[PDB]
A and B are shown apart, each in its own frame.
Chain A
């Protein structure tokens, strides 16, 4: 039996990505940036390929690499450039064109897909593998019954009993 998110339109998205002839499209390095038509100094900047960790404030795991095959979780991020305050109002000003484009719009299923996008666009990239969660609990409090075990204070000595 096979049932891996088999009740939604994502079935019709996984295929249409493996249609023959279109599943083997490939370009040389930096070639997609030449035909993109954006200024060429944009590709002198550095990019980071990484999957963001779970927020500490909440316990849910949906925006992590646990659901990597279900949901795109890998991101492309750029270093910050200068910001200052507006003299009249105090609003935060910037001259960065890539200020929100990687964090809002570019999401990928795997690390290699984001690498392929960076390679064909000409961005130099560094890849950061996320830290793997550990599921095995401690030896103490491994199960619920270890809360009430004999490991709290040892086996009780029967020396204060009447008739000792």
Chain B
């Protein structure tokens, strides 16, 4: 379960009903058939989670009933198993979203660093809360648990669905202030590419920190692995 999906049962919509059609393109069908070959033929059902992910980029950022039924027919499994998998996992959107899916981490290591102020900045700028889409159909705001980027807290991940399967981008933006996330949102809206990763350092190397969620404060100190890398070496395996 995620935001934007308050139902664990199907609700009919003119956009989302049993009459709606889904079909793969040629290249997406090639991708899906390449995914299936990673697994034994009598355990072909192992491929459901990557195939459903690929179907989610193909359909435009969300899974419809027709897409799930097509995936069920493709993997030769009952549709209720597919509905179980699609409702179980957090990334699978089952209602229509915007072009870019903005997901903010809210767990305690990001919360100490001031993720609440980043949420406040996003809501003041875009004009929407968590679980909502803008009136232009551009941004969808969501909340996530810990994203495994806690040393660069506080962070936002943004998913790109404007290019389909071939140009799918899931980009982490880290070490943020309100100004950084406002600039990233403006850069995306204007058509540019904001810089990935941390906004004040390269990686998880020792440098400063965001103090109070509003200002980066650089700090100098001991850094490891600053010299030349180690040479190849092996001991004598005989005796």
Q: Interface-forming stretch among B39-47, B136-144, B145-153, B166-174?
A: B39-47
Say yes or no: A160 contacts B42, CB within 8 Å.
no
A153 with B39: CB separation less than 8 A? no
- Known contacts A153-B42, A157-B40, then 15 further A-B pairs from the complex at CB < 8 Å, ordered by chain A residue: A153-B43, A154-B42, A156-B40, A156-B42, A156-B43, A157-B41, A157-B42, A158-B40, A159-B40, A159-B41, A160-B37, A160-B38, A160-B39, A160-B40, A160-B41
| A150-164 interface (Cβ within 8 A of B) | 153-154, 156-160
Most chain A Cβ neighbours within 10 Å, of B37, B38, B40? B40
Task: Tell me whether chain A's interface is mostly helix, strand or loop, or mixed.
Answer: loop
Query: Beta-carbon contacts of A132-164 to B below 8 Å, as 1s and 0s?
Result: 000000000000000000000110111110000
Q: How many A residues touch B, CB cutoff 8 Å?
A: 7
**Interface class of chain B by DSSP:** loop
How many B residues touch the partner, as a band?
Answer: under 10
Nearest CB in chain B: distance from A126 CB, A: 49
12 A-B residue pairs with Cβ-Cβ distance under 8 Å, sorted by A, are A154-B42, A156-B40, A156-B42, A157-B40, A157-B41, A157-B42, A158-B40, A159-B40, A160-B38, A160-B39, A160-B40, A160-B41
Q: Which residue of A lies closest to B38 (CB)?
A: A160
How far does the Cβ of A160 sit from chain B's closest Cβ, in whole Å?
5
In the complex, the chain A residue whose C-beta lies closest to that of B40 is: A156
Contacts of A159 in B (CB 8 A): 40-41
Rounded to whole angstroms, the CA-CA distance of A154 and B40 in the bound complex is 11
CB neighbors of A among B23-57 (8 A): 37-43
The interface residues of chain B lying within 8 Å CB-to-CB of A154 are 42
Q: In the complex, which residues of chain B have a beta carbon less than 8 angstroms from the beta carbon of A157?
A: 40-42
Give the distance in Å from the alpha carbon of A154 to the alpha carbon of B43 in the complex: 9
User: With a CB–CB cut-off of 8 A, which chain A residues contact B42?
Assistant: 153-154, 156-157
How many Å lie between the Cα of A158 and that of B40 in the bound state? 6
Q: In the bound complex, how far is the Cα of B45 from the Cα of A153, in angstroms?
A: 11
State the Cβ distance, A147 to closest chain B Cβ, in Å: 15
Residues of B within 8 Å of A158, CB to CB, are 40
Chain A residues, Cβ within 8 Å of B43:
153, 156
On chain A, the residues within 8 Å of B40 by CB distance are 156-160
| Bound-state Cα–Cα, A158 to B38, Å | 10
